[PDB]
Amino acid sequence: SMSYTWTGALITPCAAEESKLPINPLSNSLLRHHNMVYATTSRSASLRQKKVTFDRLQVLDDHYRDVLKEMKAKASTVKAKLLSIEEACKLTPPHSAKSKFGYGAKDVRNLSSRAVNHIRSVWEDLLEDTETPIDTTIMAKSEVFCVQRKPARLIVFPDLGVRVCEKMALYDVVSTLPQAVMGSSYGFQYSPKQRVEFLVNTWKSKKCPMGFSYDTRCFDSTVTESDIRVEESIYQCCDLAPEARQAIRSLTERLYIGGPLTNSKGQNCGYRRCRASGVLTTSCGNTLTCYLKATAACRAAKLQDCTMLVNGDDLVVICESAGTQEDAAALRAFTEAMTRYSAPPGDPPQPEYDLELITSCSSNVSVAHDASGKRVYYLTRDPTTPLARAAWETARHTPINSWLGNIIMYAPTLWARMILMTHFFSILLAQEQLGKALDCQIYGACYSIEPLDLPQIIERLHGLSAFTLHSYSPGEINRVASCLRKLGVPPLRTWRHRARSVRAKLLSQGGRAAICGRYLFNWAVRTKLKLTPIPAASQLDLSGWFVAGYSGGDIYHS
Numbered sequence: 023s024m025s026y027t028w029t030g031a032l033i034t035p036c037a038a039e040e041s042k043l044p045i046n047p048l049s050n051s052l053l054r055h056h057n058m059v060y061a062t063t064s065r066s067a068s069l070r071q072k073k074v075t076f077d078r079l080q081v082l083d084d085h086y087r088d089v090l091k092e093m094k095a096k097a098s099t100v101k102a103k104l105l106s107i108e109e110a111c112k113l114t115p116p117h118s119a120k121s122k123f124g125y126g127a128k129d130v131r132n133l134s135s136r137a138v139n140h141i142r143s144v145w146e147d148l149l150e151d152t153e154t155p156i157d158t159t160i161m162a163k164s165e166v167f168c169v170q171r172k173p174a175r176l177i178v179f180p181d182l183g184v185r186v187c188e189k190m191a192l193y194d195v196v197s198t199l200p201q202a203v204m205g206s207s208y209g210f211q212y213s214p215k216q217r218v219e220f221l222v223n224t225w226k227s228k229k230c231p232m233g234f235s236y237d238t239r240c241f242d243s244t245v246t247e248s249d250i251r252v253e254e255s256i257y258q259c260c261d262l263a264p265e266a267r268q269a270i271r272s273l274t275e276r277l278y279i280g281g282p283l284t285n286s287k288g289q290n291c292g293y294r295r296c297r298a299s300g301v302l303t304t305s306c307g308n309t310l311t312c313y314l315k316a317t318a319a320c321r322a323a324k325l326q327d328c329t330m331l332v333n334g335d336d337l338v339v340i341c342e343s344a345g346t347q348e349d350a351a352a353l354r355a356f357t358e359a360m361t362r363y364s365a366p367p368g369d370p371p372q373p374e375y376d377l378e379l380i381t382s383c384s385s386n387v388s389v390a391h392d393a394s395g396k397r398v399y400y401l402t403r404d405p406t407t408p409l410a411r412a413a414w415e416t417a418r419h420t421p422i423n424s425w426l427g428n429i430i431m432y433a434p435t436l437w438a439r440m441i442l443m444t445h446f447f448s449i450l451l452a453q454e455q456l457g458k459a460l461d462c463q464i465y466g467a468c469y470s471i472e473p474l475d476l477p478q479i480i481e482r483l484h485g486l487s488a489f490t491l492h493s494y495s496p497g498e499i500n501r502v503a504s505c506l507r508k509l510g511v512p513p514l515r516t517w518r519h520r521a522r523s524v525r526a527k528l529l530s531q532g533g534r535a536a537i538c539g540r541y542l543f544n545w546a547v548r549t550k551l552k553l554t555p556i557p558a559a560s561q562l563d564l565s566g567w568f569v570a571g572y573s574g575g576d577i578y579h580s
């Protein structure tokens with residue numbers, strides 16, 4: 023069937039859309055080539071519609087059916103809880119899209135009578151009605167990139183009342199079932215340090231390792247009605263409260279498998295028969311679907327001793343090499359099996375014999391050295407998108423600060439320490455806002471974080487070695503240097519000069535700011551301050567940070 027059908031009504035904005043990086047002094051101090059930085063808008067939506075609209079021709083076989091049964095026998099061990107209205111309301115981000123039913127996210131969080139009454143009526147409707155398709159809004163996503171232009175991604179989501187009901191029935195399932203089913207292969211259970219550790223240990227555990235990333239083109243459009251019903255069959259293996267079992271059954275048929283698309287103007291836009299990006303089960307469903315198809319495809323391909331790592335639609339496989347020619351032919355057999363399963367590749371996969379050359383979750387393993395000179399593996403990425411986005415967030419107030427999440431996730435990197443930490447600490451210090459909590463996202467979930475807490479967070483997640491790394495790899499240094507020239511970012515010597523300046527001001531303030539000066543900026547000076555375990559690091563409630571993925575799931579933790 024067709025991933026989408028369209029009425030001809032346009033994908034419309036709900037307000038004025040900005041496509042150009044503003045010319046602002048603060049963002050200009052970070053990046054001078056502002057014309058290279060753009061935000062996607064509804065103006066490119068038709069280009070995306072064309073790419074995501076196609077017929078799916080899925081063929082399932084015995085290997086697929088065997089892997090499915092193995093996944094279900096593991097899902098059978100799960101006992102899932104039904105969330106109360108109150109618990110589900112508290113997981114709603116303060117700025118989540120308002121309901122069309124006379125209340126918003128603040129009303130949800132305050133447990134307002136109108137919000138609570140409507141959510142209860144939506145819940146009773148899911149229990150009684152197993153068929154009526156649930157309305158969804160289609161929007162063009164506003165995302166920032168560096169030129170060389172991507173069309174806007176399309177987001178599909180139901181009303182706020184429905185999103186609260188999704189949490190009541192499936193929050194516990196989507197949080198606990200993926201790890202029970204996929205074990206060590208579930209990527210969202212790892213912090214970046216644990217992801218680095220699993221990848222490195224997996225790589226070296228092979229006699230002659232071969233690895234590859236597998237990029238499925240427009241993964242959400244490749245997800246069929248059969249895939250969504252297969253996903254529910256896994257959810258149905260859980261011990262569930264009877265209303266949760268009914269709500270999962272009704273949600274699957276009324277929302278998850280497909281439904282009507284309404285634009286911002288309330289016009290009938292089309293119809294979806296594939297994965298909606300903005301529902302609670304997208305991350306979990308995508309991971310299970312990608313894991314199932316990839317595991318079955320590895321068997322068909324006869325790839326030896328596979329270790330997979332799955333994060334939604336992102337897939338990396340590390341296996342035992344059979345030889346160069348054997349590997350290349352087995353990879354083509356893998357791709358052919360994936361294509362039959364309705365998961366064709368974007369860029370055709372290529373076998374890799376160097377772990378540092380594999381990009382998975384838009385990241386790669388690299389090496390640096392700590393204070394003692396010992397090797398430290400850490401995750402890094404090309405800094406272009408992070409820097410373009412940090413320039414936008416400097417010139418405009420955004421609901422999510424990708425710079426803060428990037429510092430948290432990429433704390434050991436040369437670019438997050440020298441540029442991102444220096445830029446934002448300089449600005450926030452001048453603005454008396456180092457202690458002001460900001461929203462950022464970790465594995466799709468939203469967190470309210472004060473930048474002054476960054477040292478304990480970093481220590482906890484990456485270890486004290488994140489504050490001592492030096493002698494980064496030549497390939498890492500060159501990718502950073504080439505990015506700075508391309509975007510017109512000032513050179514690293516300018517960043518060192520700015521860091522020495524803010525470090526001095528941070529130290530003079532005492533308290534948490536002096537902790538920031540000591541740990542975050544020790545790299546900027548020759549006279550190193552002693553770095554000991556931060557007392558607050560050991561008490562950090564980092565429960566729920568690296569449990570599951572919630573991209574598009576409207577989740578607020580913290």
Ligand SMILES: CS(=O)(=O)Nc1cccc(S(=O)(=O)NC(=O)c2c(-c3ccc[nH]c3=O)c3cc(Cl)ccc3n2Cc2ccnc(N)c2)c1
Binds near residue numbers: 309571
């Ligand atoms: C819709 S889907 O099918 O769910 N896929 C999905 C797509 C994008 C983001 C997401 S996500 O779930 O929002 N996870 C991420 O965005 C993300 C980050 C990250 C970086 C900076 C700030 N905050 C973050 O969480 C990250 C950092 C390192 Cl060191 C390693 C893996 C990482 N992932 C997973 C990931 C998984 C798949 N593709 C990726 N590019 C990244 C999930």
